[PDB]
């Protein structure tokens, strides 16, 4: 799985979207467990998310200190952010993601963990 050298800092169920600006609409990329994984050798923290049943990767990127979580006009339980190097589908790509959770509490927990992981990565 290439996860055996990592510690699960945080896990939450979520639905991930990517923005398609050609169509100016959000498109689902996956639903499943969003995991914050800290590599035990480098202490680098990444988001890794796999789809239910197929276990296919829909998010794989470092939680960069440069990223910023922003609200979406329609939701009190989601965050959108620009990511510049996600390798879920092969070569590194940039996306505008949105990630939605089961509750506002989960979304607030995710944001606090996201920022904790950003501090870890700055070292």
């Amino acid at each position: 799985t290439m996860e055996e050298d990592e510690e699960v800092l945080y896990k939450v169920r979520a639905k991930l979207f990517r923005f398609d600006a050609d169509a100016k609409e959000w498109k689902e990329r996956g639903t499943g467990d969003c995991k914050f994984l800290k590599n035990k050798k480098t202490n680098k923290v990444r988001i890794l998310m796999r789809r239910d049943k197929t276990l296919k990767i829909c998010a794989n990127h470092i939680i960069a200190p440069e990223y910023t979580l922003k609200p979406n006009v329609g939701s009190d339980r989601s965050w959108v952010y620009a990511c510049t190097a996600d390798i879920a589908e092969g070569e590194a790509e940039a996306f505008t993601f949105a990630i939605r959770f089961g509750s506002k509490e989960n979304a607030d927990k995710f944001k606090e963990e996201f920022e904790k992981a950003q501090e870890i990565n700055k070292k």
């Binding site: 991930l16 979207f17 990767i57 006009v73 329609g74 939701s75």
Partner: protein
């Protein structure tokens, strides 16, 4: 290791939506009728290595049928789709099956009843028996709720590889790039993110 899969069924039953869900994760809500055929490669990781389906997603509307049974040549498996909210699409399943097996006489075939997420169901479980004498696998599926959405490919893979214990496994996850561009230095960042923020996410009443 790749296998040709033809996907057939009446127009609007959900063939392209089902394929797009598997390709990209998305749920396409609009109905854009397929013109002839669209071919999409589709890879699954298994405990027996990767399996690749070349998915021939064919047109169900007669006036868009293109080459019709010409698409079936050299197929190694197939999915016949119908819509459990539309009885006419089930009544046409014998017709699609007839055309298919006249070209592909000995292939594994899954019969799929789509849209089982809709509450007002018209083709009830007990009505669905066409697969019995024809040796097809049957699944209730929903591309919308993803109920059983992996099962047609898992069953076909087990038949094509010849291993009933085959399972999907978690794809490898390489360490992602650590040095990345700051998106906020990209100038169009402010415009691009505002558009994303002020476009509402779909289905805000869903549980996720």
């Amino acid at each position: 290791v790749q296998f040709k899969l033809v996907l057939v069924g009446d127009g609007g039953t959900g063939k392209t939506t089902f394929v797009k869900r598997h390709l990209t994760g998305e749920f396409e809500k609009k109905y854009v009728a397929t013109l002839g055929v669209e071919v999409h490669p589709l890879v699954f990781h298994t405990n027996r290595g990767p399996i690749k389906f070349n998915v021939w997603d064919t047109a169900g509307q007669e006036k868009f049928g293109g080459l019709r049974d010409g698409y079936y040549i050299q197929a190694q498996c197939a999915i016949i789709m119908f819509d459990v909210t539309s009885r006419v699409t089930y009544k046409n399943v014998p017709n699609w099956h007839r055309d298919l097996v006249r070209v592909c006489e000995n292939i594994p075939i899954v019969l799929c009843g789509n849209k089982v997420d809709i509450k007002d169901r018209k083709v009830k479980a007990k009505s669905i028996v066409f697969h019995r004498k024809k040796n097809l696998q049957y699944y209730d599926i929903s591309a919308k709720s993803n109920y059983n959405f992996e099962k047609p490919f898992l069953w076909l893979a087990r038949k094509l590889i010849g291993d009933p214990n085959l399972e999907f496994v978690a794809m490898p996850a390489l360490a992602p790039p650590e040095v990345v561009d700051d998106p906020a230095l990209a100038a169009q960042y402010e415009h691009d993110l505002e558009v994303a923020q002020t476009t509402a996410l779909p289905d805000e009443d869903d549980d996720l």
